[PDB]
Design a protein around this ligand. Structure first.
Ligand SMILES: *[C@@H]1O[C@H](CO)[C@@H](O[C@@H]2O[C@H](CO)[C@@H](O)[C@H](O)[C@H]2NC(C)=O)[C@H](O)[C@H]1NC(C)=O
Ligand SMILES: *[C@@H]1O[C@H](CO)[C@@H](O[C@@H]2O[C@H](CO)[C@@H](O)[C@H](O)[C@H]2NC(C)=O)[C@H](O)[C@H]1NC(C)=O
Ligand SMILES: *[C@@H]1O[C@H](CO)[C@@H](O[C@@H]2O[C@H](CO)[C@@H](O)[C@H](O)[C@H]2NC(C)=O)[C@H](O)[C@H]1NC(C)=O
Ligand SMILES: *[C@@H]1O[C@H](CO)[C@@H](O)[C@H](O)[C@H]1NC(C)=O
Ligand SMILES: *[C@@H]1O[C@H](CO)[C@@H](O)[C@H](O)[C@H]1NC(C)=O
Ligand SMILES: *[C@@H]1O[C@H](CO)[C@@H](O)[C@H](O)[C@H]1NC(C)=O
Ligand SMILES: *[C@@H]1O[C@H](CO)[C@@H](O)[C@H](O)[C@H]1NC(C)=O
Ligand SMILES: *[C@@H]1O[C@H](CO)[C@@H](O)[C@H](O)[C@H]1NC(C)=O
Ligand SMILES: *[C@@H]1O[C@H](CO)[C@@H](O)[C@H](O)[C@H]1NC(C)=O
Ligand SMILES: *[C@@H]1O[C@H](CO)[C@@H](O)[C@H](O)[C@H]1NC(C)=O
Ligand SMILES: *[C@@H]1O[C@H](CO)[C@@H](O)[C@H](O)[C@H]1NC(C)=O
Ligand SMILES: *[C@@H]1O[C@H](CO)[C@@H](O)[C@H](O)[C@H]1NC(C)=O
Ligand SMILES: *[C@@H]1O[C@H](CO)[C@@H](O)[C@H](O)[C@H]1NC(C)=O
Ligand SMILES: *[C@@H]1O[C@H](CO)[C@@H](O)[C@H](O)[C@H]1NC(C)=O
Ligand SMILES: *[C@@H]1O[C@H](CO)[C@@H](O)[C@H](O)[C@H]1NC(C)=O
Ligand SMILES: *[C@@H]1O[C@H](CO)[C@@H](O)[C@H](O)[C@H]1NC(C)=O
Lengths: 380, 390, 227, 196, 49, 98
């Protein structure tokens, strides 16, 4: 490994820092909440009376096991355009709440349902925040929402004093005042009804035909989870390096019991690294601390490669009288297992040395190991 | 009765001299003064691991990081060079003597009292009374030779900054010379200058009684030796007082060792900023690699991971560059201390204002955490009288 | 009648739901400025106070005088409006198009399809004596829909003008009304020193966390040069 | 100033810049350290004397003419004739202590580079020691070496006639003092020409 | 900012930010090196004085 | 350039440019630091030549170990070599002094 790190077939006398040693995980666990219901998507997509754009319909989804793959056979949609999360990776996440908003628009206005847009729909009818996290689904519905004599059942707002704030509804039938004379409901000259009819015919070309739209908004934040994908929950193991999947939060480490004082609305913990420190178990409501795997630095002490092939190994700042990291099969990254050298293990203030025996004489320093300890190649 | 005021700073006191055609002022007494000088000699040795710092326990991030060439062999080489230079800095200052000298069992040097600087056998560390205040008034954040791992998990309370640094791949190495054989070097240097004069710095050590050495030192600055012998006892007293009040002026002052603490503070602050820099988005979805990996498919998570990688590489290069500049500054300051030890201690210096203020007589070295302290003994004139000259 | 009083260091809530310990976190959000003017009202009518950037509400009642609050614009039967009328054991938060009461607190509902019920907000206790005048503090805001309410009951107060010290607020509920709110009003019954109102502003605070995860102190960053 | 240099009077750019962590506290710290070091540099060179010395009213030093180096009372700045020809042959771009703001708008013609730098957040600070009390330090240093020799650098200042000090200085390089006294006048001339 | 909608102006603004940060870091680094050189030259003058 | 049309080859070329510029700036910075170190070491040699060679030095341990007598310069590739001739005491004997 020393010859590999510095690209040569020969090594001069000295001490070289090669790599780090780490302890590999031995098991994987998954922990999701205790819920079994199947919350309905078939009551949103499969309907008959999709609402107007100016009064759009909102439904809230709660404790259930959501499955975002059985909704591909509810509508001819070709695909979901998603912003915060990739549509593929939707069955492995847990969200606090889900909101489904349904309405119907024209084809050429479908591009207006996106963050940071402008128009007659993104200004007075339906506005999305710039930091949207969710998906939209639009599909053609010319077979249903059209008539030979016209479909005068959908309306859209045309005039408004000011632009809407995101996710705000403005159902009201007043009389717009665009001019000087303060009309009092006559709706005559320079005073219009704010709502405009939105008639549809089968003869119109694409981009002038009705399009049915449903948008899904998630809450990917830190709070108790309510809507989760369909993944099973294994058992819980402590005081052992494992891989964990705590409620969509993946990682690796050692899980142990905690003395912390999480408040009822608390769910996670953090130190000053913007990384998680403690977790509340979804089905037990107990606090667990997470500790990184055992790791350290390895150095190789060698004489000249033209003198001998023997080496000594220094593990940097470890208590190998208690932490020898001796493994079997696949449990540790540097796989050579130089251990079991008999009475040839030394404990230095700078770590511990394997492969060199400590003599009780004194000589001039040849190879500096540290803390006043040197090493050298000598005769017997 | 208390307020904030503004003024124009004053350059100093006012004085006028009495120059005349035939008039000369000559002193009639003298004073023995002892000052102190503090010099940094070395800094802390640190090491950084790219793989743990940038891409924590991730394989996809490691595979992406392999595509940037050798931007981490270079940082490792720079840090290793700095560490080796730090080890070499303290060898030049202290390892000036080939042998190790010892004081005689009976300590009577004509009246001069060297109790405050000679090693103390009763103390387990065998350190002078003056080099125990220097070691208690400077607090190192990390000594390095602690093998701390094993208790970061059981801290229970808010884990200290050291564990946060350690878990992210930043480590501190211990110095080669322990601060117990540096004191042996100082004892050897100081025990060979009060029993042999300056002879041990040139050839073999040759013993000589202390009063005769002091007479030689006076003769070297232009005062005849008979001045010392006729005023020996008095001079001894002026020395004993001078040492007696140099300990107190260090024991009660708030912070006299301000040069040897700024190094520790700067290194700790640099490491803390390096750790805190990890929680930055750099214009990505999130600052956690295990979050953007579990919310996006592999094709379009690579952009976010690339943003994180290219932010953290720069964040680390800035640190190594500033470390190189600071190391150069410390090397210059250590070369100065080596020269001062060779000239003030192993001999008598004729340069003005180099080895303290006044006419230089002697100097004594002491060791402080990451630095050296010089006690300069100088001769100052005193009460002067007017005279007519031709 | 009404008057003005000083708020001192009062009205600080938890920015989020993450446990922290022994840190100096700094957050920029809607907060009540330190050393501001809070309007103290009296009751013996009930003006429609303006609502903007959220409202901090404080009351020191013996047992109960305040039922709930009303929100909306023009407070009539032409725009949607909230209702947070309380109860002996429940809460009747709802969004509707109420018409009026001018004194049930509404006459008719026109286009109303939102309701919500949970535990009551007001909780009181006494040590066999009414001298434990617990002070109730609430904070309301309307950031991007999602009506946020924070609350805290401090029963250790005796009460002359306003307590001096520091305390924190915990969240209660988040819920999507999705309306325009401009005006504000209070609902209170009759009987047989309280009702202080203040307004929040966008400010940056630096908060200090205890060793047990509580908030012990905070410093404003737009009050003094020293701050 | 990072905010003015990078994102000129923009809020969206500022909000984006907040996402890069502390890449501007570090630059500010580095520049402040450099400035403080610059202030400390001139204190070590010049502030070598604790007191301030003055020349006698009558200036006769055995023949030596120190007119070209002693301060000139007639000049308002109290600077030597030689220390003026050096202050006129070096032209500083920005002194710093000018408070220039107020005329960049009324330049009318092509605005100078200083206004272009100022409008973008780059500023120059003035030194702590004005170049009028540095000359006082130099005068104190120079007036105590021609009336007391080198004695004022060790302990109290002790006066001594200039020819005897010159005799000591010759004796220090291996020439006996009687060489000076027997060739005093000539030597003085060779000095006066050398300065001239 | 006046030719693109907010979603795709962020890329351009990020390019400008990441260019100017480097442009400024180079300046501060060169200033540090020059300051060290001047400090050495000032120590020499102090000794000479 | 031969596998992509001009509009979307610019992104890749920009990546290469922004990598190589940094790769070169690192080199010039390290060169500046090393040059400063060499300048300091050359100033020391100039002083040593002025003091040891063109005169006799009374400073301890400057111009070799012992009591300095002479020095001779020699030139080596990219450097200088000083031969310092010094005087060292020898066989010593005890005596009684007053
Ligand atoms: C030179 O100075 C010393 C110290 O100031 C003088 O010694 C002092 O002499 C007085 C009177 O004899 C004593 O009261 C003090 O105790 C002495 N001081 C010490 C430290 O012993 C000395 O007398 C002075 N020499 C002359 C000639 O005046
Ligand atoms: C040398 O100095 C030491 C330290 O000042 C003297 O020891 C002190 O003597 C005084 C007077 O008897 C005591 O009150 C202190 O407790 C002593 N301190 C220590 C640390 O011993 C000593 O007497 C002096 N003379 C010698 C050693 O001959
Ligand atoms: C000292 O030197 C000054 C400067 O050279 C002499 O002053 C000059 O004297 C000449 C001859 O009389 C005049 O032509 C110049 O105009 C003088 N210049 C100034 C600035 O005064 C001075 O005479 C010399 N001797 C002294 C002062 O005793
Ligand atoms: C809804 O589903 C039922 C049963 O599958 C079907 O008969 C009906 O046509 C569907 N409605 C729409 C609008 O597709
Ligand atoms: C809410 O109503 C007020 C008063 O008419 C108006 O100024 C404001 O713009 C409205 N808010 C929104 C988001 O339309
Ligand atoms: C999960 O719910 C089932 C059904 O009520 C119950 O039998 C089981 O005990 C629950 N498990 C946990 C860990 O809460
Ligand atoms: C050899 O070293 C060991 C190490 O402590 C020590 O105990 C022992 O006394 C030593 N023996 C000799 C003969 O040096
Ligand atoms: C010193 O001698 C010169 C020359 O005679 C004379 O001009 C000067 O006044 C004398 N000094 C004093 C103080 O009298
Ligand atoms: C290292 O091991 C020794 C021997 O058991 C023990 O005394 C010491 O406390 C250990 N150190 C740590 C940090 O665990
Ligand atoms: C020497 O004489 C001058 C002038 O008379 C006087 O100012 C000075 O103080 C005298 N020196 C001493 C030590 O008294
Ligand atoms: C509160 O208002 C009064 C006016 O009634 C004013 O004098 C006072 O300064 C205000 N308080 C503060 C803290 O500004
Ligand atoms: C109050 O609560 C009681 C019992 O919880 C219930 O019977 C009553 O209808 C509620 N009244 C209102 C106005 O909510
Ligand atoms: C509200 O209800 C009335 C009563 O039928 C109805 O006429 C009106 O259209 C409704 N408005 C909305 C927006 O639902
Ligand atoms: C934290 O709680 C414990 C009770 O287990 C208490 O002893 C301690 O004082 C609390 N901390 C503070 C800072 O009050
Ligand atoms: C600053 O104000 C003073 C006083 O009016 C004036 O003389 C000077 O010209 C002003 N400087 C500038 C740059 O405006
Ligand atoms: C001088 O005498 C001492 C003590 O008798 C002895 O140790 C030393 O070796 C002697 N010196 C020489 C040069 O013999």
């Amino acid at each position: 490994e020393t010859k590999c790190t510095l690209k040569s077939f020969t090594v001069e006398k000295g001490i070289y820092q090669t790599s780090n040693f780490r302890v590999q995980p031995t098991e994987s666990i998954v922990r999701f909440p205790n819920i079994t219901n199947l919350c309905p998507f078939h009551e949103v997509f499969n309907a008959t009376r999709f609402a107007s754009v100016y009064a759009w319909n909102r439904k809230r989804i709660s404790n259930c096991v959501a499955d975002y793959s059985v909704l591909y056979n509810f509508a001819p949609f070709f695909a979901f355009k998603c912003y915060g999360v990739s549509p593929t990776k939707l069955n492995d996440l847990c969200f606090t709440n889900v909101y489904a908003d349904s309405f119907v628009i024209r084809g050429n206005e479908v591009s207006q349902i996106a963050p940071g847009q402008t128009g007659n729909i993104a200004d007075y009818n339906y506005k999305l925040p710039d930091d949207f996290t969710g998906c939209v689904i639009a599909w053609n519905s010319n077979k249903l929402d059209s008539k030979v004599s016209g479909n005068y059942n959908y309306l859209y707002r045309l005039f408004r004093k000011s632009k809407l704030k995101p996710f705000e509804r403005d159902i009201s039938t007043e009389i717009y005042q665009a001019g000087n004379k303060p009309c009092n409901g006559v709706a005559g000259f320079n005073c219009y009804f704010p709502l405009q009819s939105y008639g549809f015919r089968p003869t119109y070309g694409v981009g002038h035909q009705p399009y049915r739209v449903v948008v899904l908004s998630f809450e990917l934040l830190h709070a108790p989870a309510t809507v989760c994908g369909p993944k099973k929950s294994t058992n819980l193991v402590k005081n052992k390096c494992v891989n964990f999947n705590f409620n969509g939060l993946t990682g690796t480490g050692v899980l142990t019991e905690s003395n912390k004082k999480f408040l009822p609305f608390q769910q996670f913990g953090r130190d000053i690294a913007d990384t998680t420190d403690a977790v509340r178990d979804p089905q037990t409501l107990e606090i667990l601390d997470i500790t990184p795997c055992s790791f350290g630095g390895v150095s190789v002490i060698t004489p000249g490669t033209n003198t001998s092939n023997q080496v000594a190994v220094l593990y940097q700042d470890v208590n190998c009288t208690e932490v020898p990291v001796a493994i079997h099969a696949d449990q540790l990254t540097p796989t050579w297992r130089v251990y079991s050298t008999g009475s040839n293990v030394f404990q230095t203030r700078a770590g511990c040395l394997i492969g060199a025996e400590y003599v009780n004489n004194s000589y001039e320093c040849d190879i500096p190991i540290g803390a006043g300890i040197c090493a050298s190649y000598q005769t017997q | 009765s208390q307020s904030i005021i503004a003024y124009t700073m004053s350059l100093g006191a006012e004085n006028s001299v009495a120059y005349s055609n035939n008039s000369i002022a000559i002193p009639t007494n003298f004073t023995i003064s002892v000052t102190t000088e503090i010099l940094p000699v070395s800094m802390t040795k640190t090491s950084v691991d790219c793989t743990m710092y940038i891409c924590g326990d991730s394989t996809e991030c490691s595979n992406l990081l392999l595509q940037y060439g050798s931007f981490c062999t270079q940082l490792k080489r720079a840090l290793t060079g700095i560490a080796v230079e730090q080890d070499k800095n303290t060898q030049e200052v202290f390892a000036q003597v080939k042998q190790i000298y010892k004081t005689p069992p009976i300590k009577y040097f004509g009246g001069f009292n060297f109790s405050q600087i000679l090693p103390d056998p009763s103390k387990p560390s065998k350190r002078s009374p003056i080099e125990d205040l220097l070691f208690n008034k400077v607090t190192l954040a990390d000594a390095g030779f602690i093998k701390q791992y094993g208790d970061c998990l059981g801290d229970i309370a808010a884990r200290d900054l050291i564990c946060a640094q350690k878990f992210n791949g930043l480590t501190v190495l211990p110095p080669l010379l322990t601060d117990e054989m540096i004191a042996q070097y100082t004892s050897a240097l100081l025990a060979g200058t009060i029993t042999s004069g300056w002879t041990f710095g040139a050839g073999p050590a040759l013993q000589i009684p202390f009063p005769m050495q002091m007479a030689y030192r006076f003769n070297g600055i232009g005062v005849t030796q008979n001045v010392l012998y006729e005023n020996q006892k008095l001079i001894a007293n002026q020395f004993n007082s001078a040492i007696g009040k140099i300990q107190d002026s260090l024991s009660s002052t708030p912070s006299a060792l301000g040069k040897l603490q700024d190094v520790v503070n700067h290194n700790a602050q640099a490491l803390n900023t390096l750790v805190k820099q990890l929680s930055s988005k750099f214009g990505a979805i999130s600052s956690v690699l295990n979050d953007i990996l579990s919310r996006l498919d592999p094709p379009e998570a690579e952009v976010q991971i690339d943003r994180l990688i290219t932010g953290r590489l720069q964040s680390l290069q800035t640190y190594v560059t500033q470390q190189l500049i600071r190391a150069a500054e410390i090397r210059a300051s250590a070369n100065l201390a080596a020269t001062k030890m060779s000239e003030c201690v192993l001999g008598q210096s004729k340069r003005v204002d180099f080895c303290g203020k006044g006419y230089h007589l002697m100097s004594f070295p002491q060791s402080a955490p990451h630095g050296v302290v010089f006690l300069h003994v100088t001769y100052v004139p005193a009460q002067e009288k007017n005279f007519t000259t031709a | 009648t009404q008057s003005y009083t000083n708020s001192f260091t009062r009205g600080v809530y938890y920015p989020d739901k993450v446990f922290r310990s022994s840190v100096l976190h700094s957050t920029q959000d809607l907060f009540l400025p330190f050393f501001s003017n809070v309007t103290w009202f009296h009751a013996i009518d009930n003006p429609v106070l303006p609502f903007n950037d959220g409202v901090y509400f404080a009351s020191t009642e013996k047992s109960n005088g305040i039922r709930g609050w009303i929100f909306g614009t023009t407070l009539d039967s032409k725009t949607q409006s909230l209702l947070i009328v309380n109860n002996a054991t429940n809460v009747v938060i709802k969004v509707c198009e109420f018409q009026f009461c001018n004194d049930r607190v509404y006459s008719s509902a026109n286009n109303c399809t939102f309701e919500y019920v949970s535990q009551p907000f007001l909780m009181d206790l006494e040590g066999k004596q009414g001298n434990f005048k617990n002070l109730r503090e609430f904070v309301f805001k309307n950031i991007d829909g999602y009506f946020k309410i924070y609350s805290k009951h401090t029963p250790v107060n005796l009460g002359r003008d306003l307590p001096q010290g520091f305390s924190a607020l915990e969240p209660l509920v988040d819920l999507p009304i999705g309306i325009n709110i401009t005006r504000f009003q209070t609902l209170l019954a009759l009987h047989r020193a309280a009702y202080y109102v203040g307004y929040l502003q966008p400010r940056t605070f630096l908060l200090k966390y205890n060793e047990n995860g509580t908030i012990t102190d905070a410093v404003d960053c737009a009050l003094d040069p020293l701050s």
